[PDB]
Amino acid sequence: ASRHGQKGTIGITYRREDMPFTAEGIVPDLIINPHAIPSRMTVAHLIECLLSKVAALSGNEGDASPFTDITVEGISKLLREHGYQSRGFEVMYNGHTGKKLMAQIFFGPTYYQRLRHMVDDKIHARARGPMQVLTRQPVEGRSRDGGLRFGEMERDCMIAHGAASFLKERLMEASDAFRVHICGICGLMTVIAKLN
Amino acid sequence: MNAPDRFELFLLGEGESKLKIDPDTKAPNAVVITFEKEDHTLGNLIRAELLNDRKVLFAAYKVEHPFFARFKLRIQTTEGYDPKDALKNACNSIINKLGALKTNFETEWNLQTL
Amino acid sequence: LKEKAIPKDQRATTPYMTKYERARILGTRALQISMNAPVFVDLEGETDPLRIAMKELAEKKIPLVIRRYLPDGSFEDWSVEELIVD
Amino acid sequence: RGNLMGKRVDFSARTVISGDPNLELDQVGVPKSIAKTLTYPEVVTPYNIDRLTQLVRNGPNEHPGAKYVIRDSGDRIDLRYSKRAGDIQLQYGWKVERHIMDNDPVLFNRQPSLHKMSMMAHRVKVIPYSTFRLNLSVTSPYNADFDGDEMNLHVPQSEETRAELSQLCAVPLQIVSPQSNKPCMGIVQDTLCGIRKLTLRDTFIELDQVLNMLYWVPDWDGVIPTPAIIKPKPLWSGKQILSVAIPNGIHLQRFDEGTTLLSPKDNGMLIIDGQIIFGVVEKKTVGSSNGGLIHVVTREKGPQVCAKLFGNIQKVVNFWLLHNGFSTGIGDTIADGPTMREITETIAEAKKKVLDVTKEAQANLLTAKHGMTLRESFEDNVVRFLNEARDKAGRLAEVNLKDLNNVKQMVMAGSKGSFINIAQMSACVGQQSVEGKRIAFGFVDRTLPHFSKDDYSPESKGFVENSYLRGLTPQEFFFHAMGGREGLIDTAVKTAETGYIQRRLVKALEDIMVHYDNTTRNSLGNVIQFIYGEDGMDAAHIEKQSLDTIGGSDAAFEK
Amino acid sequence: ANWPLPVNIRRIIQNAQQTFHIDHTKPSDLTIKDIVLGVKDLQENLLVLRGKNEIIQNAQRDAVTLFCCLLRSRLATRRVLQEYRLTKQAFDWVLSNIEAQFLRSVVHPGEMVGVLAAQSIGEPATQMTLKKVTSGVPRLKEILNVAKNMKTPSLTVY
Amino acid sequence: TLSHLRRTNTPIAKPRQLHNTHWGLVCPAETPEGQACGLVKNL
Amino acid sequence: SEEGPQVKIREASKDNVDFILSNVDLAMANSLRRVMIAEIPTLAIDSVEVETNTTVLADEFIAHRLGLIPLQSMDIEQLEYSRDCFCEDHCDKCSVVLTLQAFGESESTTNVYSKDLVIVSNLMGRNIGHPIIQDKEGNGVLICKLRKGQELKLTCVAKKGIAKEHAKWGPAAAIEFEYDPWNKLKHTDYWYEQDSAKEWPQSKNCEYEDPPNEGDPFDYKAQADTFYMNVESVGSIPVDQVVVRGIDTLQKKVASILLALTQM
Amino acid sequence: MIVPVRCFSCGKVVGDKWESYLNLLQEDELDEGTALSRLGLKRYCCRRMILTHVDLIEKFLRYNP
Amino acid sequence: YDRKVPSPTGEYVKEPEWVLETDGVNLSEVMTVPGIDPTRIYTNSFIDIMEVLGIEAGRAALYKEVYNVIASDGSYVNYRHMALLVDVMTTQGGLTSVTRHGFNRSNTGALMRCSFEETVEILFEAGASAELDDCRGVSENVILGQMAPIGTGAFDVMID
Amino acid sequence: SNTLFDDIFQVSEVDPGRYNKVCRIEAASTTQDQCKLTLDINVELFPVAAQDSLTVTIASSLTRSWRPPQAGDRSLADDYDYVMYGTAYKFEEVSKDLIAVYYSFGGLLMRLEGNYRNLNNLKQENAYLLIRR
Amino acid sequence: EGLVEYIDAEEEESILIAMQPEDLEPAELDVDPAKRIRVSHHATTFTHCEIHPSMILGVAASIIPFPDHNQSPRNTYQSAMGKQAMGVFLTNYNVRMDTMANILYYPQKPLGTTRAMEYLKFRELPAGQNAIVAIACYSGY
RNA sequence: AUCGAGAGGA
Ligand SMILES: [Mg+2]
Ligand SMILES: [Zn+2]
Ligand SMILES: [Zn+2]
Ligand SMILES: [Zn+2]
């Protein structure tokens, strides 16, 4: 995620040649979807892009302190003095074809943080496995090789479709199936069975 | 963990042929070739050099998935024209251009003094 | 309670295979295919039990009768061939 | 509640999800690791026996393989640690627990189970990388996004259960939604903006691009369409290339605002036999809305064709969008100078109006409307002034924004954003509201210690004159923080309350099933509705049709 | 005039116009008697219940009343020839298509309407997030739980 | 580490809402999101 | 002068070469750039074994850094892929073994450079694996800093690889690609608030191409045949060899396609 | 913790530059950016590797064990 | 209030009408007042509508208020789904709250009750009842694990 | 296998309709004033300047997969400096003995109303437009 | 010396504060349009002046760049995300034995920093990398 | 095995 509340997760990893390239050959390490931005209204993300490019060219630090009077037009004037587009849009070329992209593309330096949610640590699968003694049902958690919970909400969502036999196999044979001997005169499972 | 090994991008495997050719169903003189363990690099150039030739009607390269390393080249040519022949002619023309440019740039470098 | 029944003539149950009976019959037929029970349609390049069941449904050859139940207690029986699929 | 109704179950999976555009809507991107662990029990038949034997030869560590075998007696045979795993000879009736394989049915679920649409079953596609993958168009029924969201997966264990999932819980069937009687899935995000950009009459494809895009369509016949422009170059229209994906025999008409058959604005849509005549594609034509193309294709042809259509549209549009490019930037939020000056003059006019209203309030000359406090009337009038000022400045800015502006194009496609987003970004963010009121006098007669006592004014009450781009002052920042805190507590409480409400509704209406006689009854036998919906019809097959006899005069009726 | 109903007769009419390539110069081959009696026959052809007793027949007729009104509005003898050009073949095809679509539209017995309705009301309520009258989830609470006392009792005098 | 070392907890008519008196004493928006949103603040 | 593509070089240096490509289709240009970045092979460290480490840096970090270190790969043609050789693990002709040992004897911090690196296996007349140093002082690329009382001892086996497998086998750093300096072909549509010319900077390459004139109709027939490019060297291979090896590798891929077609 | 070998996007070698750059800004009172330009780094993506890098190695060295 | 009404020619035309709103409801006296239309008056409180006009009028008003809640957000639900809940409350006597007070105290089977709130009290009172659960309810069969009489298991499949 | 309609028009107005490569052109027929048109055109590939009179023809021919222009041994369908392929969506009648034709060329839109022809431009998918200087 | 004082929340109600010291300078035209519109203070008898507005926000907020231009809930979301963000907690990491620890290979100090960030030790001990970020539609992933 | 704390998602 970025410092402006824009969270994300990798979909694909491309090689350097497959990425679009600027005239200087600069390849973006990171590509994020424009459609996210309008709903969030995190303009400081774009401002960070602009100011980081300007600072990298200047060899001087950029001030992003809040409530400090700084003008986007002024930073754009600086970038213009440095021979780049004032807003920061840069012409880019398709990696796969080498053809110019009709839309000039915004790309610049941006602080980005790794987060404590790795795919490998979260992923889990159960199949058959350990069962808690009291309920004869799967133990809890990936580390205990446990089984996911089929919620009562999930049960309702399945009842809506109507797959009664699927629900029977999920809630009887999958988790805790059991066979019990019962007596009619008792009405209860007081019978003792010498099955052998 | 689940990642495919890197060498799978540029190395063939067991039971894998570099080119597999299958005719297009419901199409005249049309064939799709499954280039394996190859990427955009070869396909775009092959398709462009096919497009330069007049006799071929159709030439297109499709990348099935960015995950894997394969691409499909569909070619449709004139009646009496083997699509394989058109592919070979385009390839040889490519090679001639490459050699000519290599020699020209070598002479240019020999001219260069720095 | 005793000899509960519905005469075949003038039955008002819908002459259509609702999604649920089609699904259950297809699943049971697929179970039969997986159990190596005899198959009464000729198969052409088919191994999956479910597609075999679908083809048998198209050929209208499945010896099963769907039992519709009315809340009063009287039951109606509709054979697969009488039932139709849209 | 927890161990009887709803239970931890076997053969379960869950991972982080990411979106793959080149992945069919019904397919699910099952990683290889889960396929190895999860098993489907299968019974050996002469049809499958070969493959099954081969499976067990491959072993449990490499997929397609088999983890376990079951004899007729039932004593399990473990593939991982057994000396016989190489020389097994399987007789008929024995069971092989094969690995999860492509083109198999599995339930795919998102954790908030607010919908039956959340529990649909997908086809299996085994993929290398670890993330669960899915189509962008199947996110909407789940409400899932790729910010790290996690989803779950269930594997059936019997042929009949697989049939229930395949024929009752298939994704294409759940496209038509019983609530709102409209499709719940549609063309989303990059594909939508790309389709808008492509359908423009200004944009024209060329022969090479046309050939590649044509090949991208899977069921494409191979007939090359005739070019739209023929004299100087063989140009093509994006509408033609897109019509290559529209099924034959499909007709759609859409008239809105001013839609002449000439259609200078190119608004409205005319589609005949899979070819598009005039118009520019946007959310109304291609989206989940009633009368959207998804609805028409699902009703006219069938659901599988509609899912294939999802795929085709995504492939073609994403290819062209890759080749055209798109972005956002600060320049998209910068407004023209004189437009900013007119916005500021609008704000100043609003300030003067508020000042004059306060001056009238001070002189005790204002009249009292019946049933409203003097202060109530004053507050409401000033609030309306500020709201109208913000909206007017936003409209001014939006007029100044050119059609090349990226955020404008995103809103035009309907991909993301609204008018309020633009107005807050470039003109003014608005007047803050807390508990349905202006900013309160938390301190003694002062909203902040920096303001004077007994000061009823727009800035003390927290109207932020600046926009997001222009830069908020510290006091405006704090007031905005108050408002955002109210928003966050609203989410944190409303989630729990609505979950409780949904649970109670579900527990009340479990037994409502339409019986054979078409009445809706509970378990006891009590009737609720003798005919469900009073017309006895499923809510999916219900569409908005105009009754021409109701409107109009008697004379036009007669004519 | 815009209301939700099955079958979407307008789309069937457009399908008929394109499918048969109807030509406007030629006159129709439809019989007036056949047009009106066929609309009546189609009214007789749509069924929701099949019992042979009077109350069930009346229930069926009242249950399909609105759809029959739409049928009569869509298939007017003047409109069938003047508004669009029609042939007997296309007219009978449209009649059969309307019948088949309506028959497909009927609820299948066995569907749990209650669970579906509960979910369909619950889901937009989760989406609700934000005037002297109660609105939103608290208003839904007032409606759902029998409220001896309301926070905003009111009434409108006409 | 720093933000955890500087933490507030409020055990329990409108507590969670950012108050005017919180100006400068308490950070306006550095609060957890969840069941205990707003009750826990940062200095 | 040979019929076909023509090249004219603007400037030359050991690090960078700028040239104007002429009479070419654009597809082969981007394909060649892809081949240059990835496909052409290089020698780099693929195995490291650490006998002793006392540095504050962990071993995996060091192995990554060593894999990144640039090594000479000019005679890589005589060297063969370790996977194509017949050795059990590493042959002298398939792998190059280099050892590094360092002790922080100085009380002042003893830094470690790429220069301080020894070669064990036989060079066999080849120019392979020489640690390239462009530093003005002659010291190598910094790897670690050792406090007094610290030592590090390890052995590396370097094999041939492709930049597709790992970015370490990368022959070039920056590639510069430009065409349509006047945008006459209109392959891109500029974004402007007031005016495109005033807002968008003029490219240098614009000077060499003939300026467009307003009042002339847009040329439909015109297609891009003039291109401007610039190539940079990591130094593992000189620039001219890098680009000509790219050409040759692309030709080899085409030839292998042709061979498979012949085989079928 | 220690100087990057190469820029993750440039790929240009930057390990040999680091020391010089530091010495350059101390002996000549050089601006950081002028030192970067003198060092031969004309691209801002390789310039970030140098400008923002922080030598955490020095603090770890101070630890006696 | 703007209003749509048939003009003498026949077409629907707009009509502005004065209409007033209250702050509290005492319905029984309000309707018996000159100068108002008893057929057109409306109220927020549906319980008073049920008391005054009968149960069906309250049913319709309840649907109207739910519809207003749904349409305030802009969302829309097909009339069948909401009408189902309104009819469920209306069908047995007076209005029944969707809470343990009203809809769990019904005559439905005891296990379907114990799945909701007040589990143990339901179980105890029912144990003193010796009431016989019909086992028709879906919750009852979910607890039993047997295939519930859902549409898939509603019919019994038999051979010819 | 011949032309359906031919005329010479003069452009009354040229309109850039928020498009940079396409303008809507309005044209009046010379000689007989009972007919006139308005067509969406690509000005970038053919400059349509005002005060310029242009020739207009429509041809039925000269399905089958498209093929390149080839060697040109096949004769030009027209030496005219503009040609398009399109299909007509609606045929309308403005008044008795007065017809209006609505055509669309892949999204571009043509409207031509006239009375003289009643045997041409029938309701068939195929149609070609040719425009000379 | 008395040049600065400690203010309790109760005592604040009696005092009047100006955000900027320049507010006390005498008032008197031309102004650049982009700079933020601030209200002419229109008030006198200021008892005190704030040290700097950036102090009202907390430590996590001081990391956020240009939070004045962003939506407040997003600032909250980032304030929650910095805790989950990976970084070098302390230099003694190698010596200490924590039950779980994570550390970046090549930590980099943000190119654009808040002034308060100086006293937060972020530039000296950063927890992110400065990546070249492009906003564009590429392959729809 | 209890109970607590923290975080993830709309
Ligand atoms: Mg999320
Ligand atoms: Zn007993
Ligand atoms: Zn070897
Ligand atoms: Zn770089």
Curated annotation (Swiss-Prot), chain E:
Entry comment on modification after translation: The tandem 7 residues repeats in the C-terminal domain (CTD) can be highly phosphorylated. The phosphorylation activates Pol II. Phosphorylation occurs mainly at residues 'Ser-2' and 'Ser-5' of the heptapeptide repeat. The phosphorylated form of Pol II appears to carry, on average, one phosphate per repeat. The phosphorylation state is believed to result from the balanced action of site-specific CTD kinases and phosphatases, and a 'CTD code' that specifies the position of Pol II within the transcription cycle has been proposed.
Where in or outside the cell?
Nucleus
Q: What is known of its domains?
A: The C-terminal domain (CTD) serves as a platform for assembly of factors that regulate transcription initiation, elongation, termination and mRNA processing.
Family indicated by similarity: Belongs to the RNA polymerase beta' chain family.
Per UniProt, subunit arrangement is: Component of the RNA polymerase II (Pol II) complex consisting of 12 subunits. Interacts with DEF1; the interaction is direct and serves to bridge RPB1 to the Elongin complex in a DNA-damaged dependent manner. Interacts with the Elongin subunit ELA1. Interacts with the Elongin subunit ELC1. Interacts with ASK10. Interacts with ESS1. Interacts with RTT103. Interacts with SHE2.
Name listed for the protein in its UniProt record: DNA-directed RNA polymerase II subunit RPB1
Q: Which residues of the full protein are shown?
A: 952 to 1119 of 1733
Swiss-Prot record, chain F:
Tell me which domain of life the UniProt entry assigns to the organism this sequence originates from: Eukaryota
Q: Give the UniProt subcellular location, in the record's own words.
A: Nucleus
* Family recorded in the similarity comment: Belongs to the RNA polymerase beta chain family.
Further remark: The binding of ribonucleoside triphosphate to the RNA polymerase II transcribing complex probably involves a two-step mechanism. The initial binding seems to occur at the entry (E) site and involves a magnesium ion coordinated by three conserved aspartate residues of the two largest RNA Pol II subunits.
Describe its assembly. Component of the RNA polymerase II (Pol II) complex consisting of 12 subunits.
Query: What does this protein's UniProt record list under function?
Result: DNA-dependent RNA polymerase catalyzes the transcription of DNA into RNA using the four ribonucleoside triphosphates as substrates. Second largest component of RNA polymerases II which synthesizes mRNA precursors and many functional non-coding RNAs. Proposed to contribute to the polymerase catalytic activity and forms the polymerase active center together with the largest subunit. Pol II is the central component of the basal RNA polymerase II transcription machinery.
Under what name is this protein listed? DNA-directed RNA polymerase II subunit RPB2
Upper classification of the organism: Eukaryota, Fungi, Dikarya, Ascomycota, Saccharomycotina
Q: What fragment of the whole protein does this chain represent?
A: 491 to 539 of 1224
UniProtKB/Swiss-Prot annotation, chain G:
Listed A to Z, the keywords are:
Acetylation, DNA-directed RNA polymerase, Metal-binding, Nucleus, Transcription, Zinc
Role according to the record: DNA-dependent RNA polymerase catalyzes the transcription of DNA into RNA using the four ribonucleoside triphosphates as substrates. Component of RNA polymerase II which synthesizes mRNA precursors and many functional non-coding RNAs. Pol II is the central component of the basal RNA polymerase II transcription machinery. It is composed of mobile elements that move relative to each other. RPB3 is part of the core element with the central large cleft and the clamp element that moves to open and close the cleft. Seems to be involved in transcription termination.
Which terms in the GO cellular component ontology are assigned? Answer: nucleoplasm; nucleus; RNA polymerase II, core complex
Q: Which residues form the signal peptide?
A: none
Specify first residue, last residue and whole-protein length for the fragment: 2 to 265 of 318
Additional detail = Present with 10000 molecules/cell in log phase SD medium.
Q: Which gene encodes it?
A: RPB3
Please provide the Gene Ontology terms (biological process) for this protein.
RNA-templated transcription; termination of RNA polymerase II transcription; transcription by RNA polymerase II; transcription elongation by RNA polymerase II; transcription initiation at RNA polymerase II promoter
Q: Where are the transmembrane segments?
A: none
Q: What is this protein called?
A: DNA-directed RNA polymerase II subunit RPB3
**Example of a GO MF term:** DNA-directed RNA polymerase activity
Q: Where does Zn(2+) bind?
A: C85, C87, C91, C94
Localisation per UniProt entry: Nucleus
Q: How does it assemble?
A: Component of the RNA polymerase II (Pol II) complex consisting of 12 subunits.
N-acetylserine modifications at: S1
Q: Which organism is it from?
A: Saccharomyces cerevisiae (strain ATCC 204508 / S288c)
Curated annotation (Swiss-Prot), chain H:
* Primary location: nucleus
Question: Biological process GO annotation list?
Answer: nucleolar large rRNA transcription by RNA polymerase I; ribosome biogenesis; RNA-templated transcription; termination of RNA polymerase I transcription; termination of RNA polymerase III transcription; transcription by RNA polymerase I; transcription by RNA polymerase II; transcription by RNA polymerase III
Compartments annotated for it: namely:
Nucleus, Nucleolus
Xref: Pfam families: RNA_pol_N (PF01194)
Per its UniProt record, what Gene3D superfamilies does this chain match? Homeodomain-like (1.10.10.60)
What is any one of the record's Gene Ontology cellular component terms?
RNA polymerase I complex
| Swiss-Prot/TrEMBL keywords | DNA-directed RNA polymerase, Isopeptide bond, Metal-binding, Nucleus, Ribosome biogenesis, Transcription, Ubl conjugation, Zinc
Q: Which residues form a coiled coil?
A: none
Task: Tell me what else is known.
Answer: Present with 5300 molecules/cell in log phase SD medium.
Self-association state and partner proteins as the record states: Component of the RNA polymerase I (Pol I), RNA polymerase II (Pol II) and RNA polymerase III (Pol III) complexes. Component of the RNA polymerase I (Pol I) complex consisting of 14 subunits: RPA135, RPA190, RPC40, RPA14, RPB5, RPO26, RPA43, RPB8, RPA12, RPB10, RPC19, RPC10, RPA49 and RPA34. The complex is composed of a horseshoe-shaped core containing ten subunits (RPA135, RPA190, RPB5, RPO26, RPB8, RPB10, RPC10, RPA12, RPC19 and RPC40) where RPA135 and RPA190 form the DNA-binding cleft.
Q: Which family does it belong to?
A: Belongs to the archaeal Rpo10/eukaryotic RPB10 RNA polymerase subunit family.
* Protein name per UniProt: DNA-directed RNA polymerases I, II, and III subunit RPABC5
